[PDB]
Design a protein around this ligand. Structure first.
Ligand SMILES: CSCCC(=O)C(=O)O
Ligand code: NI
Length: 179
């Protein structure tokens, strides 16, 4: 099952697991209280998968593309990787479905503590508009992912602080309503 955990207090080597000690695992149920949703799929079938279609139709994910994060392949790699890992929010959902490889999505919990979510092949996640988050490769230094979007995409990150946005205000309001 998909693994997530509270992080330790080391700021070094962000691609390491950084598991809090003792272990403080985080469940999919706790992630849902943050508005973070998850589906498990057969990533070998991504070109033609009725199960992915069920999710895309339910959620109105009408747009997709594929991105490959690789030190050799990706244009403007070093700058893009830095922008992924700066703590930021978006005014839309961030939806990613991992097709190959792996990485970490970090999200803030209700007390603004970091939770690290380990995403591997077959894992699909949506991070709600307004949530503070970041992404890093793990020590294997490779991921291929499908990006999805509700309509034509706008990718703009707003690096924290970004508290004035309506999307952030509405998200804070959502958090009051969950466990
Ligand atoms: C696993 S997708 C690569 C990360 C990314 O697209 C993002 O942070 O927006
Ligand atoms: Ni983002």
């Amino acid at each position: 099952m998909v693994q997530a955990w509270y992080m330790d207090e080391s700021t070094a080597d962000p691609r390491k697991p950084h598991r809090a000690q003792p272990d403080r695992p985080v469940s999919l149920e706790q992630l849902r209280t943050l508005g973070v949703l998850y589906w498990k799929l057969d990533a070998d079938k991504y070109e033609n998968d009725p199960e992915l279609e069920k999710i895309r139709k339910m959620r109105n994910y009408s747009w997709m593309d594929i991105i490959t994060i690789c030190k050799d392949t990706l244009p403007n790699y070093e700058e893009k990787i830095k922008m992924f890992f700066e703590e930021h929010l978006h005014l839309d959902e961030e939806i990613r479905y991992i097709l190959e490889g792996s990485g970490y999505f970090d999200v803030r919990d209700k007390e603004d503590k970091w939770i690290r979510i380990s995403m591997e092949k077959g894992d699909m996640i949506t991070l709600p508009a307004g949530i503070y988050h970041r992404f890093t490769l793990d020590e294997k230094n490779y991921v291929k992912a499908m990006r999805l979007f509700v309509g034509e995409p706008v990718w703009t990150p707003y690096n924290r602080p970004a508290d004035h946005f309506d999307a952030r205000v509405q998200y804070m309001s959502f958090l009051e309503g969950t466990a």
